[PDB]
Amino acid sequence: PRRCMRHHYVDSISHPLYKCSSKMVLLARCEGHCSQASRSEPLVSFSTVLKQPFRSSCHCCRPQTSKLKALRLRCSGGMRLTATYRYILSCHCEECNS
Amino acid sequence: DPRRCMRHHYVDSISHPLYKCSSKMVLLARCEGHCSQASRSEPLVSFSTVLKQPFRSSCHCCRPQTSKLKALRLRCSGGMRLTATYRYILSCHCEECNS
Ligand SMILES: [Cl-]
């Protein structure tokens, strides 16, 4: 089966540079195999050599809708610091380059 | 031999989209298949104002790996000679959507 599904997991958010207390939060990701085949066929040009010579279709498992989240970290030096990220609510198969 | 990323041959009629021309039949190739790799998309974290692209993604697509540039002269009604170009695909493979 393993089609484009939404998946829950937990992770701990840290600042990549500063020293802060790890806060762990529930996240979601999209993952799976879109059923549609991907394809790529040549375009014909009477004007120029084509910068992009190919017409293609490719479906990828991506977030369809998501909710923005804020997160404050207790960072050393009495620093309060805030992080943003998007909690994924639904996933779908979507064209690689819309 | 499953339905994976590979080359397919077909003959196609080349014609100008605007001008009247004597069409030419040519052998073409395209890529088509199902890459084994699962696609995925995860949220990114940022301490700036919200990120414009909030997700890091992986997605493999069946694309031309190698190709040969072709040209073709079409005879057209106005006595005009029109030259088309296209790429003859030589090999296909699964490649990341972004690049
Ligand atoms: Cl010529």
Residue numbers in the entry:
A (entry chain B): 36 to 133
B (entry chain A): 35 to 133
Task: Quote the study's own text.
Norrie Disease Protein (NDP) gene encodes Norrin, a secreted cystine-knot like growth factor, distinct from the lipid-modified Wnt. Unlike Wnts which have promiscuous interactions with Fz receptors, Norrin specifically binds to Fz4CRD, but not to the 14 other CRDs of Fz and secreted Frizzled-related protein (sFRP) family members. The Norrin mediated pathway maintains the blood-retina and blood-brain barriers and regulates angiogenesis in the cochlea and uterus as well as neuroprotective effects on retinal neurons. Our crystallographic and solution studies further reveal that dimeric Norrin forms a complex with two copies of monomeric Fz4CRD.
We determined three crystal structures of Norrin, using selenomethionine-labeled protein for phasing. The Norrin protein fold is identical to that of the previously reported MBP-Norrin crystal structure. Each Norrin monomer comprises three β-hairpins (β1-β2, β3-β4 and β5-β6), a β7 strand at the C-terminus, and four intramolecular disulphide bonds. The two monomers assemble as an elongated, head-to-tail, dimer stabilized by three intermolecular disulphide bridges (Cys93-Cys95, Cys95-Cys93, and Cys131-Cys131), in agreement with small-angle X-ray scattering (SAXS) measurements which showed Norrin dimer in solution. On inspection the superpositions revealed a high degree of conformational plasticity in the β1-β2, β3-β4 and β5-β6 loops. Conversely, the structural comparisons underscore the conserved nature of the interface at the dimer core.
